[PDB]
PDB file of all heavy atoms in Angstrom:
ATOM      1  N   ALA A  19      88.701 115.612 101.259  1.00 58.80           N
ATOM      2  CA  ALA A  19      89.951 116.330 101.475  1.00 58.80           C
ATOM      3  C   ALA A  19      89.922 117.146 102.767  1.00 58.80           C
ATOM      4  O   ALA A  19      90.904 117.175 103.510  1.00 58.80           O
ATOM      5  CB  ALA A  19      90.271 117.219 100.284  1.00 58.80           C
ATOM      6  N   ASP A  20      88.791 117.800 103.032  1.00 57.71           N
ATOM      7  CA  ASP A  20      88.611 118.540 104.279  1.00 57.71           C
ATOM      8  C   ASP A  20      88.736 117.600 105.475  1.00 57.71           C
ATOM      9  O   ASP A  20      89.437 117.894 106.445  1.00 57.71           O
ATOM     10  CB  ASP A  20      87.245 119.230 104.306  1.00 57.71           C
ATOM     11  CG  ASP A  20      87.159 120.394 103.340  1.00 57.71           C
ATOM     12  OD1 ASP A  20      88.222 120.858 102.878  1.00 57.71           O
ATOM     13  OD2 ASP A  20      86.033 120.854 103.050  1.00 57.71           O
ATOM     14  N   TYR A  21      88.055 116.463 105.380  1.00 57.82           N
ATOM     15  CA  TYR A  21      88.071 115.446 106.427  1.00 57.82           C
ATOM     16  C   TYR A  21      89.494 114.968 106.718  1.00 57.82           C
ATOM     17  O   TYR A  21      89.873 114.767 107.874  1.00 57.82           O
ATOM     18  CB  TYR A  21      87.178 114.272 106.010  1.00 57.82           C
ATOM     19  CG  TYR A  21      87.129 113.124 106.993  1.00 57.82           C
ATOM     20  CD1 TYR A  21      86.277 113.156 108.089  1.00 57.82           C
ATOM     21  CD2 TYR A  21      87.923 111.997 106.815  1.00 57.82           C
ATOM     22  CE1 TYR A  21      86.222 112.102 108.982  1.00 57.82           C
ATOM     23  CE2 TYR A  21      87.882 110.943 107.703  1.00 57.82           C
ATOM     24  CZ  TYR A  21      87.031 110.998 108.785  1.00 57.82           C
ATOM     25  OH  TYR A  21      86.997 109.941 109.665  1.00 57.82           O
ATOM     26  N   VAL A  22      90.279 114.802 105.660  1.00 58.14           N
ATOM     27  CA  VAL A  22      91.659 114.348 105.775  1.00 58.14           C
ATOM     28  C   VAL A  22      92.549 115.423 106.401  1.00 58.14           C
ATOM     29  O   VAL A  22      93.422 115.120 107.215  1.00 58.14           O
ATOM     30  CB  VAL A  22      92.230 113.926 104.397  1.00 58.14           C
ATOM     31  CG1 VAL A  22      93.724 113.656 104.488  1.00 58.14           C
ATOM     32  CG2 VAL A  22      91.499 112.698 103.875  1.00 58.14           C
ATOM     33  N   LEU A  23      92.317 116.678 106.022  1.00 60.04           N
ATOM     34  CA  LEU A  23      93.057 117.806 106.582  1.00 60.04           C
ATOM     35  C   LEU A  23      92.808 117.980 108.075  1.00 60.04           C
ATOM     36  O   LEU A  23      93.746 118.007 108.871  1.00 60.04           O
ATOM     37  CB  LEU A  23      92.673 119.099 105.865  1.00 60.04           C
ATOM     38  CG  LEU A  23      93.521 119.538 104.674  1.00 60.04           C
ATOM     39  CD1 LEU A  23      92.620 120.038 103.557  1.00 60.04           C
ATOM     40  CD2 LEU A  23      94.495 120.623 105.108  1.00 60.04           C
ATOM     41  N   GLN A  24      91.535 118.111 108.441  1.00 62.94           N
ATOM     42  CA  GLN A  24      91.142 118.340 109.828  1.00 62.94           C
ATOM     43  C   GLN A  24      91.684 117.279 110.779  1.00 62.94           C
ATOM     44  O   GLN A  24      92.069 117.587 111.907  1.00 62.94           O
ATOM     45  CB  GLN A  24      89.618 118.404 109.952  1.00 62.94           C
ATOM     46  CG  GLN A  24      89.000 119.688 109.436  1.00 62.94           C
ATOM     47  CD  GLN A  24      87.484 119.646 109.444  1.00 62.94           C
ATOM     48  OE1 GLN A  24      86.860 119.438 110.485  1.00 62.94           O
ATOM     49  NE2 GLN A  24      86.882 119.834 108.274  1.00 62.94           N
ATOM     50  N   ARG A  25      91.718 116.033 110.318  1.00 60.94           N
ATOM     51  CA  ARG A  25      92.080 114.913 111.180  1.00 60.94           C
ATOM     52  C   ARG A  25      93.510 114.423 110.967  1.00 60.94           C
ATOM     53  O   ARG A  25      93.890 113.369 111.481  1.00 60.94           O
ATOM     54  CB  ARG A  25      91.103 113.756 110.988  1.00 60.94           C
ATOM     55  CG  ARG A  25      89.650 114.141 111.165  1.00 60.94           C
ATOM     56  CD  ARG A  25      88.781 112.907 111.111  1.00 60.94           C
ATOM     57  NE  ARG A  25      88.374 112.475 112.443  1.00 60.94           N
ATOM     58  CZ  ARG A  25      87.130 112.562 112.903  1.00 60.94           C
ATOM     59  NH1 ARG A  25      86.163 113.057 112.138  1.00 60.94           N
ATOM     60  NH2 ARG A  25      86.848 112.145 114.130  1.00 60.94           N
ATOM     61  N   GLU A  26      94.292 115.192 110.215  1.00 60.84           N
ATOM     62  CA  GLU A  26      95.700 114.881 109.969  1.00 60.84           C
ATOM     63  C   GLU A  26      95.930 113.453 109.479  1.00 60.84           C
ATOM     64  O   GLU A  26      96.870 112.781 109.909  1.00 60.84           O
ATOM     65  CB  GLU A  26      96.541 115.159 111.217  1.00 60.84           C
ATOM     66  CG  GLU A  26      96.731 116.634 111.513  1.00 60.84           C
ATOM     67  CD  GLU A  26      97.653 116.878 112.691  1.00 60.84           C
ATOM     68  OE1 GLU A  26      97.725 116.008 113.584  1.00 60.84           O
ATOM     69  OE2 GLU A  26      98.311 117.939 112.721  1.00 60.84           O
ATOM     70  N   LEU A  27      95.061 112.991 108.586  1.00 60.30           N
ATOM     71  CA  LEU A  27      95.235 111.690 107.963  1.00 60.30           C
ATOM     72  C   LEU A  27      96.163 111.813 106.760  1.00 60.30           C
ATOM     73  O   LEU A  27      96.555 112.916 106.383  1.00 60.30           O
ATOM     74  CB  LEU A  27      93.884 111.115 107.540  1.00 60.30           C
ATOM     75  CG  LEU A  27      92.888 110.857 108.673  1.00 60.30           C
ATOM     76  CD1 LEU A  27      91.535 110.436 108.120  1.00 60.30           C
ATOM     77  CD2 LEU A  27      93.427 109.808 109.629  1.00 60.30           C
ATOM     78  N   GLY A  28      96.514 110.675 106.167  1.00 57.03           N
ATOM     79  CA  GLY A  28      97.359 110.647 104.986  1.00 57.03           C
ATOM     80  C   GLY A  28      98.703 111.321 105.181  1.00 57.03           C
ATOM     81  O   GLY A  28      99.147 112.091 104.332  1.00 57.03           O
ATOM     82  N   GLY A  29      99.352 111.028 106.304  1.00 59.39           N
ATOM     83  CA  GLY A  29     100.629 111.638 106.628  1.00 59.39           C
ATOM     84  C   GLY A  29     101.816 110.884 106.057  1.00 59.39           C
ATOM     85  O   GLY A  29     102.965 111.223 106.328  1.00 59.39           O
ATOM     86  N   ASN A  30     101.532 109.856 105.264  1.00 58.36           N
ATOM     87  CA  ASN A  30     102.570 109.046 104.640  1.00 58.36           C
ATOM     88  C   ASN A  30     103.221 109.750 103.447  1.00 58.36           C
ATOM     89  O   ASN A  30     102.535 110.208 102.534  1.00 58.36           O
ATOM     90  CB  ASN A  30     101.986 107.706 104.197  1.00 58.36           C
ATOM     91  CG  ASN A  30     100.712 107.866 103.389  1.00 58.36           C
ATOM     92  OD1 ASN A  30      99.916 108.771 103.640  1.00 58.36           O
ATOM     93  ND2 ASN A  30     100.518 106.993 102.405  1.00 58.36           N
ATOM     94  N   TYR A  31     104.549 109.820 103.455  1.00 56.43           N
ATOM     95  CA  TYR A  31     105.282 110.523 102.407  1.00 56.43           C
ATOM     96  C   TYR A  31     105.686 109.619 101.256  1.00 56.43           C
ATOM     97  O   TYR A  31     105.992 108.443 101.453  1.00 56.43           O
ATOM     98  CB  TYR A  31     106.521 111.212 102.985  1.00 56.43           C
ATOM     99  CG  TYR A  31     106.187 112.376 103.880  1.00 56.43           C
ATOM    100  CD1 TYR A  31     105.772 112.170 105.186  1.00 56.43           C
ATOM    101  CD2 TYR A  31     106.262 113.681 103.412  1.00 56.43           C
ATOM    102  CE1 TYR A  31     105.446 113.227 106.006  1.00 56.43           C
ATOM    103  CE2 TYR A  31     105.947 114.749 104.227  1.00 56.43           C
ATOM    104  CZ  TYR A  31     105.542 114.515 105.525  1.00 56.43           C
ATOM    105  OH  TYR A  31     105.222 115.569 106.346  1.00 56.43           O
ATOM    106  N   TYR A  32     105.669 110.185 100.054  1.00 53.13           N
ATOM    107  CA  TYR A  32     106.147 109.507  98.860  1.00 53.13           C
ATOM    108  C   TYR A  32     107.570 109.020  99.112  1.00 53.13           C
ATOM    109  O   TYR A  32     108.426 109.781  99.554  1.00 53.13           O
ATOM    110  CB  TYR A  32     106.093 110.462  97.663  1.00 53.13           C
ATOM    111  CG  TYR A  32     106.683 109.920  96.379  1.00 53.13           C
ATOM    112  CD1 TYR A  32     105.878 109.310  95.422  1.00 53.13           C
ATOM    113  CD2 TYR A  32     108.045 110.037  96.112  1.00 53.13           C
ATOM    114  CE1 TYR A  32     106.414 108.823  94.245  1.00 53.13           C
ATOM    115  CE2 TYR A  32     108.587 109.550  94.942  1.00 53.13           C
ATOM    116  CZ  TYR A  32     107.769 108.947  94.012  1.00 53.13           C
ATOM    117  OH  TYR A  32     108.313 108.465  92.844  1.00 53.13           O
ATOM    118  N   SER A  33     107.810 107.743  98.842  1.00 51.30           N
ATOM    119  CA  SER A  33     109.095 107.129  99.145  1.00 51.30           C
ATOM    120  C   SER A  33     109.648 106.402  97.926  1.00 51.30           C
ATOM    121  O   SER A  33     109.001 105.511  97.384  1.00 51.30           O
ATOM    122  CB  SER A  33     108.944 106.160 100.317  1.00 51.30           C
ATOM    123  OG  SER A  33     110.192 105.605 100.683  1.00 51.30           O
ATOM    124  N   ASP A  34     110.851 106.779  97.500  1.00 49.62           N
ATOM    125  CA  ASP A  34     111.431 106.210  96.286  1.00 49.62           C
ATOM    126  C   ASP A  34     112.831 105.617  96.468  1.00 49.62           C
ATOM    127  O   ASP A  34     113.809 106.154  95.944  1.00 49.62           O
ATOM    128  CB  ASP A  34     111.436 107.251  95.158  1.00 49.62           C
ATOM    129  CG  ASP A  34     112.123 108.547  95.556  1.00 49.62           C
ATOM    130  OD1 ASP A  34     112.608 108.649  96.705  1.00 49.62           O
ATOM    131  OD2 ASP A  34     112.190 109.460  94.708  1.00 49.62           O
ATOM    132  N   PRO A  35     112.929 104.498  97.199  1.00 49.72           N
ATOM    133  CA  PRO A  35     114.220 103.820  97.334  1.00 49.72           C
ATOM    134  C   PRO A  35     114.698 103.299  95.982  1.00 49.72           C
ATOM    135  O   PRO A  35     115.902 103.228  95.733  1.00 49.72           O
ATOM    136  CB  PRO A  35     113.902 102.653  98.270  1.00 49.72           C
ATOM    137  CG  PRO A  35     112.450 102.425  98.119  1.00 49.72           C
ATOM    138  CD  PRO A  35     111.852 103.777  97.898  1.00 49.72           C
ATOM    139  N   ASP A  36     113.749 102.944  95.120  1.00 48.52           N
ATOM    140  CA  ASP A  36     114.060 102.486  93.774  1.00 48.52           C
ATOM    141  C   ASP A  36     113.848 103.607  92.766  1.00 48.52           C
ATOM    142  O   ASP A  36     113.197 103.408  91.741  1.00 48.52           O
ATOM    143  CB  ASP A  36     113.177 101.295  93.397  1.00 48.52           C
ATOM    144  CG  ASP A  36     113.308 100.138  94.366  1.00 48.52           C
ATOM    145  OD1 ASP A  36     114.427  99.903  94.866  1.00 48.52           O
ATOM    146  OD2 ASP A  36     112.287  99.465  94.628  1.00 48.52           O
ATOM    147  N   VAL A  37     114.391 104.784  93.062  1.00 52.25           N
ATOM    148  CA  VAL A  37     114.217 105.945  92.194  1.00 52.25           C
ATOM    149  C   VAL A  37     114.767 105.666  90.790  1.00 52.25           C
ATOM    150  O   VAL A  37     115.940 105.327  90.629  1.00 52.25           O
ATOM    151  CB  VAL A  37     114.830 107.229  92.813  1.00 52.25           C
ATOM    152  CG1 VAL A  37     116.300 107.029  93.149  1.00 52.25           C
ATOM    153  CG2 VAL A  37     114.639 108.425  91.889  1.00 52.25           C
ATOM    154  N   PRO A  38     113.899 105.774  89.770  1.00 51.12           N
ATOM    155  CA  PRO A  38     114.232 105.426  88.382  1.00 51.12           C
ATOM    156  C   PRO A  38     115.092 106.478  87.687  1.00 51.12           C
ATOM    157  O   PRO A  38     114.985 107.663  88.003  1.00 51.12           O
ATOM    158  CB  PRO A  38     112.858 105.336  87.711  1.00 51.12           C
ATOM    159  CG  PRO A  38     112.006 106.260  88.495  1.00 51.12           C
ATOM    160  CD  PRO A  38     112.486 106.166  89.916  1.00 51.12           C
ATOM    161  N   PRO A  39     115.940 106.042  86.745  1.00 47.87           N
ATOM    162  CA  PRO A  39     116.832 106.936  85.998  1.00 47.87           C
ATOM    163  C   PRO A  39     116.095 107.752  84.939  1.00 47.87           C
ATOM    164  O   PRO A  39     114.997 107.386  84.524  1.00 47.87           O
ATOM    165  CB  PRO A  39     117.813 105.968  85.330  1.00 47.87           C
ATOM    166  CG  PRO A  39     117.042 104.711  85.177  1.00 47.87           C
ATOM    167  CD  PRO A  39     116.144 104.630  86.380  1.00 47.87           C
ATOM    168  N   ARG A  40     116.687 108.819  84.452  1.00 48.10           N
ATOM    169  CA  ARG A  40     116.057 109.567  83.393  1.00 48.10           C
ATOM    170  C   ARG A  40     117.103 110.252  82.560  1.00 48.10           C
ATOM    171  O   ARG A  40     118.229 110.395  82.970  1.00 48.10           O
ATOM    172  CB  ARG A  40     115.081 110.575  83.961  1.00 48.10           C
ATOM    173  CG  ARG A  40     115.706 111.435  85.014  1.00 48.10           C
ATOM    174  CD  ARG A  40     114.716 111.880  86.037  1.00 48.10           C
ATOM    175  NE  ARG A  40     114.472 110.863  87.026  1.00 48.10           N
ATOM    176  CZ  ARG A  40     113.361 110.792  87.726  1.00 48.10           C
ATOM    177  NH1 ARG A  40     112.418 111.679  87.528  1.00 48.10           N
ATOM    178  NH2 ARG A  40     113.192 109.842  88.608  1.00 48.10           N
ATOM    179  N   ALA A  41     116.718 110.662  81.369  1.00 48.98           N
ATOM    180  CA  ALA A  41     117.609 111.330  80.443  1.00 48.98           C
ATOM    181  C   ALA A  41     117.735 112.767  80.922  1.00 48.98           C
ATOM    182  O   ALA A  41     118.829 113.328  80.970  1.00 48.98           O
ATOM    183  CB  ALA A  41     117.041 111.284  79.041  1.00 48.98           C
ATOM    184  N   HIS A  42     116.596 113.348  81.293  1.00 50.01           N
ATOM    185  CA  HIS A  42     116.544 114.731  81.747  1.00 50.01           C
ATOM    186  C   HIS A  42     116.152 114.777  83.221  1.00 50.01           C
ATOM    187  O   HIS A  42     115.116 114.237  83.604  1.00 50.01           O
ATOM    188  CB  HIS A  42     115.522 115.537  80.935  1.00 50.01           C
ATOM    189  CG  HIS A  42     115.621 115.352  79.451  1.00 50.01           C
ATOM    190  ND1 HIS A  42     116.637 114.641  78.843  1.00 50.01           N
ATOM    191  CD2 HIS A  42     114.825 115.789  78.446  1.00 50.01           C
ATOM    192  CE1 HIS A  42     116.459 114.645  77.536  1.00 50.01           C
ATOM    193  NE2 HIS A  42     115.364 115.338  77.269  1.00 50.01           N
ATOM    194  N   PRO A  43     116.972 115.437  84.052  1.00 50.23           N
ATOM    195  CA  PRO A  43     116.704 115.528  85.492  1.00 50.23           C
ATOM    196  C   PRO A  43     115.429 116.306  85.828  1.00 50.23           C
ATOM    197  O   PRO A  43     114.936 116.212  86.950  1.00 50.23           O
ATOM    198  CB  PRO A  43     117.936 116.264  86.033  1.00 50.23           C
ATOM    199  CG  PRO A  43     118.486 117.001  84.866  1.00 50.23           C
ATOM    200  CD  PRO A  43     118.211 116.137  83.675  1.00 50.23           C
ATOM    201  N   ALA A  44     114.904 117.060  84.868  1.00 51.25           N
ATOM    202  CA  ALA A  44     113.682 117.831  85.083  1.00 51.25           C
ATOM    203  C   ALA A  44     112.427 116.996  84.828  1.00 51.25           C
ATOM    204  O   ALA A  44     111.308 117.435  85.102  1.00 51.25           O
ATOM    205  CB  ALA A  44     113.678 119.074  84.210  1.00 51.25           C
ATOM    206  N   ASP A  45     112.618 115.790  84.306  1.00 49.74           N
ATOM    207  CA  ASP A  45     111.495 114.918  83.985  1.00 49.74           C
ATOM    208  C   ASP A  45     110.807 114.334  85.210  1.00 49.74           C
ATOM    209  O   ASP A  45     111.442 114.041  86.223  1.00 49.74           O
ATOM    210  CB  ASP A  45     111.935 113.775  83.068  1.00 49.74           C
ATOM    211  CG  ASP A  45     112.075 114.209  81.633  1.00 49.74           C
ATOM    212  OD1 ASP A  45     111.758 115.378  81.350  1.00 49.74           O
ATOM    213  OD2 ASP A  45     112.489 113.384  80.793  1.00 49.74           O
ATOM    214  N   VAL A  46     109.494 114.176  85.098  1.00 50.35           N
ATOM    215  CA  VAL A  46     108.731 113.384  86.047  1.00 50.35           C
ATOM    216  C   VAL A  46     108.171 112.183  85.300  1.00 50.35           C
ATOM    217  O   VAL A  46     107.389 112.334  84.367  1.00 50.35           O
ATOM    218  CB  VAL A  46     107.585 114.185  86.676  1.00 50.35           C
ATOM    219  CG1 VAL A  46     106.702 113.272  87.504  1.00 50.35           C
ATOM    220  CG2 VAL A  46     108.136 115.319  87.525  1.00 50.35           C
ATOM    221  N   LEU A  47     108.588 110.992  85.712  1.00 53.11           N
ATOM    222  CA  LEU A  47     108.259 109.762  85.000  1.00 53.11           C
ATOM    223  C   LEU A  47     106.865 109.232  85.337  1.00 53.11           C
ATOM    224  O   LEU A  47     106.368 109.447  86.441  1.00 53.11           O
ATOM    225  CB  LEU A  47     109.321 108.696  85.293  1.00 53.11           C
ATOM    226  CG  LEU A  47     110.730 109.043  84.814  1.00 53.11           C
ATOM    227  CD1 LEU A  47     111.714 107.956  85.196  1.00 53.11           C
ATOM    228  CD2 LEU A  47     110.730 109.261  83.315  1.00 53.11           C
ATOM    229  N   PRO A  48     106.233 108.538  84.376  1.00 55.12           N
ATOM    230  CA  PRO A  48     104.906 107.932  84.547  1.00 55.12           C
ATOM    231  C   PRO A  48     104.796 107.003  85.759  1.00 55.12           C
ATOM    232  O   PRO A  48     103.745 106.980  86.394  1.00 55.12           O
ATOM    233  CB  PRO A  48     104.722 107.138  83.250  1.00 55.12           C
ATOM    234  CG  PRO A  48     105.512 107.894  82.250  1.00 55.12           C
ATOM    235  CD  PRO A  48     106.713 108.416  82.988  1.00 55.12           C
ATOM    236  N   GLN A  49     105.849 106.252  86.070  1.00 53.45           N
ATOM    237  CA  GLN A  49     105.820 105.359  87.229  1.00 53.45           C
ATOM    238  C   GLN A  49     105.622 106.163  88.505  1.00 53.45           C
ATOM    239  O   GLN A  49     104.914 105.741  89.418  1.00 53.45           O
ATOM    240  CB  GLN A  49     107.113 104.547  87.335  1.00 53.45           C
ATOM    241  CG  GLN A  49     107.560 103.902  86.041  1.00 53.45           C
ATOM    242  CD  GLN A  49     108.706 104.651  85.390  1.00 53.45           C
ATOM    243  OE1 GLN A  49     108.520 105.344  84.388  1.00 53.45           O
ATOM    244  NE2 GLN A  49     109.901 104.512  85.955  1.00 53.45           N
ATOM    245  N   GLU A  50     106.254 107.329  88.552  1.00 50.60           N
ATOM    246  CA  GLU A  50     106.171 108.211  89.707  1.00 50.60           C
ATOM    247  C   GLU A  50     104.768 108.804  89.854  1.00 50.60           C
ATOM    248  O   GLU A  50     104.194 108.807  90.949  1.00 50.60           O
ATOM    249  CB  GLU A  50     107.245 109.297  89.603  1.00 50.60           C
ATOM    250  CG  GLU A  50     108.650 108.709  89.516  1.00 50.60           C
ATOM    251  CD  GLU A  50     109.717 109.727  89.166  1.00 50.60           C
ATOM    252  OE1 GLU A  50     109.554 110.452  88.162  1.00 50.60           O
ATOM    253  OE2 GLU A  50     110.729 109.798  89.895  1.00 50.60           O
ATOM    254  N   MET A  51     104.220 109.286  88.740  1.00 50.24           N
ATOM    255  CA  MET A  51     102.838 109.756  88.682  1.00 50.24           C
ATOM    256  C   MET A  51     101.879 108.669  89.163  1.00 50.24           C
ATOM    257  O   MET A  51     100.933 108.940  89.907  1.00 50.24           O
ATOM    258  CB  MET A  51     102.466 110.161  87.250  1.00 50.24           C
ATOM    259  CG  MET A  51     103.317 111.275  86.654  1.00 50.24           C
ATOM    260  SD  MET A  51     103.162 112.829  87.549  1.00 50.24           S
ATOM    261  CE  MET A  51     101.395 113.089  87.465  1.00 50.24           C
ATOM    262  N   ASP A  52     102.138 107.440  88.730  1.00 49.14           N
ATOM    263  CA  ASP A  52     101.322 106.294  89.102  1.00 49.14           C
ATOM    264  C   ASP A  52     101.404 106.047  90.597  1.00 49.14           C
ATOM    265  O   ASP A  52     100.401 105.757  91.244  1.00 49.14           O
ATOM    266  CB  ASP A  52     101.787 105.042  88.358  1.00 49.14           C
ATOM    267  CG  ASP A  52     101.323 105.014  86.919  1.00 49.14           C
ATOM    268  OD1 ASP A  52     100.330 105.697  86.605  1.00 49.14           O
ATOM    269  OD2 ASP A  52     101.948 104.301  86.104  1.00 49.14           O
ATOM    270  N   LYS A  53     102.615 106.156  91.133  1.00 49.25           N
ATOM    271  CA  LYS A  53     102.854 105.942  92.552  1.00 49.25           C
ATOM    272  C   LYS A  53     102.083 106.954  93.392  1.00 49.25           C
ATOM    273  O   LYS A  53     101.460 106.603  94.401  1.00 49.25           O
ATOM    274  CB  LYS A  53     104.346 106.042  92.855  1.00 49.25           C
ATOM    275  CG  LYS A  53     104.739 105.388  94.158  1.00 49.25           C
ATOM    276  CD  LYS A  53     106.238 105.185  94.246  1.00 49.25           C
ATOM    277  CE  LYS A  53     106.606 104.562  95.581  1.00 49.25           C
ATOM    278  NZ  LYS A  53     107.765 103.629  95.477  1.00 49.25           N
ATOM    279  N   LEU A  54     102.130 108.212  92.964  1.00 52.23           N
ATOM    280  CA  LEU A  54     101.395 109.279  93.638  1.00 52.23           C
ATOM    281  C   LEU A  54      99.881 109.048  93.592  1.00 52.23           C
ATOM    282  O   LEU A  54      99.177 109.116  94.625  1.00 52.23           O
ATOM    283  CB  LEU A  54     101.756 110.622  93.006  1.00 52.23           C
ATOM    284  CG  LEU A  54     103.226 111.001  93.202  1.00 52.23           C
ATOM    285  CD1 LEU A  54     103.731 111.856  92.051  1.00 52.23           C
ATOM    286  CD2 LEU A  54     103.415 111.715  94.535  1.00 52.23           C
ATOM    287  N   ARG A  55      99.389 108.766  92.388  1.00 52.59           N
ATOM    288  CA  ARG A  55      97.981 108.460  92.193  1.00 52.59           C
ATOM    289  C   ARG A  55      97.559 107.341  93.128  1.00 52.59           C
ATOM    290  O   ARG A  55      96.524 107.432  93.774  1.00 52.59           O
ATOM    291  CB  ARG A  55      97.708 108.048  90.749  1.00 52.59           C
ATOM    292  CG  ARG A  55      96.784 108.979  89.983  1.00 52.59           C
ATOM    293  CD  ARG A  55      96.414 108.381  88.624  1.00 52.59           C
ATOM    294  NE  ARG A  55      97.570 107.774  87.965  1.00 52.59           N
ATOM    295  CZ  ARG A  55      98.320 108.376  87.045  1.00 52.59           C
ATOM    296  NH1 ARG A  55      98.035 109.609  86.648  1.00 52.59           N
ATOM    297  NH2 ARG A  55      99.357 107.741  86.513  1.00 52.59           N
ATOM    298  N   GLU A  56      98.379 106.298  93.213  1.00 55.07           N
ATOM    299  CA  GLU A  56      98.055 105.147  94.042  1.00 55.07           C
ATOM    300  C   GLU A  56      98.108 105.486  95.527  1.00 55.07           C
ATOM    301  O   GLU A  56      97.426 104.853  96.326  1.00 55.07           O
ATOM    302  CB  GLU A  56      98.967 103.960  93.722  1.00 55.07           C
ATOM    303  CG  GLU A  56      98.595 102.675  94.453  1.00 55.07           C
ATOM    304  CD  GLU A  56      97.134 102.295  94.275  1.00 55.07           C
ATOM    305  OE1 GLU A  56      96.626 102.372  93.135  1.00 55.07           O
ATOM    306  OE2 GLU A  56      96.495 101.919  95.280  1.00 55.07           O
ATOM    307  N   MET A  57      98.921 106.471  95.903  1.00 55.85           N
ATOM    308  CA  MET A  57      98.864 106.971  97.275  1.00 55.85           C
ATOM    309  C   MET A  57      97.461 107.514  97.539  1.00 55.85           C
ATOM    310  O   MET A  57      96.804 107.154  98.535  1.00 55.85           O
ATOM    311  CB  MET A  57      99.920 108.054  97.518  1.00 55.85           C
ATOM    312  CG  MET A  57     101.348 107.523  97.606  1.00 55.85           C
ATOM    313  SD  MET A  57     102.615 108.807  97.597  1.00 55.85           S
ATOM    314  CE  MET A  57     102.283 109.643  99.141  1.00 55.85           C
ATOM    315  N   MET A  58      96.997 108.360  96.621  1.00 58.58           N
ATOM    316  CA  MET A  58      95.651 108.924  96.742  1.00 58.58           C
ATOM    317  C   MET A  58      94.554 107.848  96.798  1.00 58.58           C
ATOM    318  O   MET A  58      93.725 107.827  97.725  1.00 58.58           O
ATOM    319  CB  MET A  58      95.382 109.906  95.602  1.00 58.58           C
ATOM    320  CG  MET A  58      96.423 111.016  95.494  1.00 58.58           C
ATOM    321  SD  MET A  58      96.047 112.252  94.236  1.00 58.58           S
ATOM    322  CE  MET A  58      94.544 112.960  94.901  1.00 58.58           C
ATOM    323  N   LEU A  59      94.564 106.956  95.810  1.00 54.98           N
ATOM    324  CA  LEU A  59      93.580 105.881  95.707  1.00 54.98           C
ATOM    325  C   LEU A  59      93.611 104.993  96.944  1.00 54.98           C
ATOM    326  O   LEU A  59      92.578 104.490  97.382  1.00 54.98           O
ATOM    327  CB  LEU A  59      93.843 105.027  94.463  1.00 54.98           C
ATOM    328  CG  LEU A  59      93.994 105.705  93.096  1.00 54.98           C
ATOM    329  CD1 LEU A  59      94.337 104.670  92.029  1.00 54.98           C
ATOM    330  CD2 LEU A  59      92.749 106.488  92.710  1.00 54.98           C
ATOM    331  N   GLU A  60      94.803 104.801  97.502  1.00 53.65           N
ATOM    332  CA  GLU A  60      94.955 103.969  98.687  1.00 53.65           C
ATOM    333  C   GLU A  60      94.301 104.637  99.880  1.00 53.65           C
ATOM    334  O   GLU A  60      93.608 103.974 100.654  1.00 53.65           O
ATOM    335  CB  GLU A  60      96.426 103.691  98.997  1.00 53.65           C
ATOM    336  CG  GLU A  60      96.631 102.617 100.052  1.00 53.65           C
ATOM    337  CD  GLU A  60      97.612 103.031 101.131  1.00 53.65           C
ATOM    338  OE1 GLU A  60      97.187 103.710 102.089  1.00 53.65           O
ATOM    339  OE2 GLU A  60      98.806 102.674 101.025  1.00 53.65           O
TER     340      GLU A  60
END
């Protein structure tokens, strides 16, 4: 994480053109969590 900070890596932003619907607008869906996790893993 330090290495990534110092060198300004991982500057790619979460992007949701196919933003999924929900019953409650306050919800964070599992697909979204997965997408974020996969940003990290990537």
